[PDB]
Design a protein around this motif. Sequence first.
Motif, PDB file in Angstrom:
ATOM      1  N   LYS A  88       2.514  -8.002   8.257  1.00 29.27           N
ATOM      2  CA  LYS A  88       1.583  -9.027   7.833  1.00 29.27           C
ATOM      3  C   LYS A  88       2.368 -10.249   7.399  1.00 29.27           C
ATOM      4  O   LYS A  88       3.590 -10.211   7.264  1.00 29.27           O
ATOM      5  CB  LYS A  88       0.686  -8.540   6.696  1.00 29.27           C
ATOM      6  N   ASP A 114      -5.156   9.195  -2.221  1.00 32.69           N
ATOM      7  CA  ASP A 114      -4.975  10.168  -1.152  1.00 32.69           C
ATOM      8  C   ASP A 114      -3.588  10.786  -1.202  1.00 32.69           C
ATOM      9  O   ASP A 114      -3.438  12.006  -1.082  1.00 32.69           O
ATOM     10  CB  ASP A 114      -5.215   9.508   0.198  1.00 32.69           C
ATOM     11  N   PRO A 153      -3.793   0.568  -2.251  1.00 34.58           N
ATOM     12  CA  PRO A 153      -4.610   1.287  -1.274  1.00 34.58           C
ATOM     13  C   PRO A 153      -3.910   2.553  -0.813  1.00 34.58           C
ATOM     14  O   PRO A 153      -2.778   2.515  -0.333  1.00 34.58           O
ATOM     15  CB  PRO A 153      -4.758   0.279  -0.134  1.00 34.58           C
ATOM     16  N   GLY A 154      -4.593   3.678  -0.959  1.00 31.39           N
ATOM     17  CA  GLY A 154      -4.057   4.944  -0.525  1.00 31.39           C
ATOM     18  C   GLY A 154      -3.278   5.706  -1.565  1.00 31.39           C
ATOM     19  O   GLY A 154      -2.584   6.662  -1.211  1.00 31.39           O
ATOM     20  N   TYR A 185       0.849  -1.180   0.000  1.00 34.27           N
ATOM     21  CA  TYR A 185       0.000   0.000   0.000  1.00 34.27           C
ATOM     22  C   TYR A 185       0.887   1.233   0.000  1.00 34.27           C
ATOM     23  O   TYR A 185       2.082   1.154   0.268  1.00 34.27           O
ATOM     24  CB  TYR A 185      -0.943   0.005   1.200  1.00 34.27           C
ATOM     25  N   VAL A 186       0.291   2.381  -0.303  1.00 35.30           N
ATOM     26  CA  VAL A 186       1.011   3.647  -0.360  1.00 35.30           C
ATOM     27  C   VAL A 186       0.786   4.404   0.938  1.00 35.30           C
ATOM     28  O   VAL A 186      -0.357   4.586   1.368  1.00 35.30           O
ATOM     29  CB  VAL A 186       0.567   4.489  -1.565  1.00 35.30           C
ATOM     30  N   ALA A 187       1.871   4.857   1.553  1.00 31.43           N
ATOM     31  CA  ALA A 187       1.794   5.561   2.822  1.00 31.43           C
ATOM     32  C   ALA A 187       1.524   7.035   2.589  1.00 31.43           C
ATOM     33  O   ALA A 187       2.178   7.666   1.755  1.00 31.43           O
ATOM     34  CB  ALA A 187       3.092   5.386   3.598  1.00 31.43           C
ATOM     35  N   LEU A 188       0.570   7.592   3.333  1.00 37.40           N
ATOM     36  CA  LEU A 188       0.216   8.993   3.140  1.00 37.40           C
ATOM     37  C   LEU A 188       1.383   9.907   3.473  1.00 37.40           C
ATOM     38  O   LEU A 188       1.613  10.908   2.790  1.00 37.40           O
ATOM     39  CB  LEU A 188      -0.996   9.356   3.986  1.00 37.40           C
TER      40      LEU A 188
END
Lengths: 60, 185
Positions: free
Chosen positions: B49, B122, B118-119, B29-32
């Motif tokens: 995970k 944003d 995900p992300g 996922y992509v970190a904000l």
Amino acid sequence: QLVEEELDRAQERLATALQKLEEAEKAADESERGMKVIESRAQKDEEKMEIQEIQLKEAK
Amino acid sequence: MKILTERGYSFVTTAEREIVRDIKEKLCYVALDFENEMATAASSSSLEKSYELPDGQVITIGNERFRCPETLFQPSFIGMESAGIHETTYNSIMKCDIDIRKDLYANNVLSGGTTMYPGIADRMQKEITALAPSTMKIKIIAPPERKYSVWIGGSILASLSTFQQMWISKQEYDEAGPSIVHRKC
Ligand SMILES: Nc1ncnc2c1ncn2[C@@H]1O[C@H](COP(=O)(O)OP(=O)(O)O)[C@@H](O)[C@H]1O
């Protein structure tokens, strides 16, 4: 008479042993069914939990 | 594949490359905010995970999850000189006529599979907002099926009635050669 008495007693006891084995393997079957359904449920619940936690992440 | 070796896992085969692609599609996922995300992963272990290879042998990854797609915004991680996707988007906008870029700022359409992390919308909106003037409305449009947007649009196009004259017929090819394609259509 020792020969034949050991013979038929051990034979009927071997029948009881094989019936015990059939019971044991049926117990294995039912336990495996419970295991598979429960692990599938755990999988669904975990993936949904992950979706929801990342959704809270993005939302906040 | 290269960043996983610092935890002990070694994938070198092409089959193992497919395995790593699956890991990427399932756990990354992509970190904000990359820096404090890094510090958080360093502090706790709530980001770890686990994944199970197709022979058992579970593997657990930590900050690799967001360090893998972070390369899209810092292509210097793989030794490239370019700018991140946010910055090239902004540059492409600022290369357009000053009257249309307000309507470009509000219709950033995302497409393709690599935009499915995900992300990513944003982070993209945060970065472009930080770059653009403080008056424009940055809107990242990320449909839930954007992985097949090209095919969907292609079917829409090929179904239009006004398109049936845009085909390159066999006879035009027989006349003009293979150069027909870009020379007219
Ligand atoms: N859910 C996902 N999350 C992250 N990356 C993905 C996901 N699905 C696909 N990808 C990446 O997208 C790539 C394929 O995307 P696609 O749009 O089909 O490319 P192409 O159009 O060139 O075939 C794969 O390399 C894969 O790493």
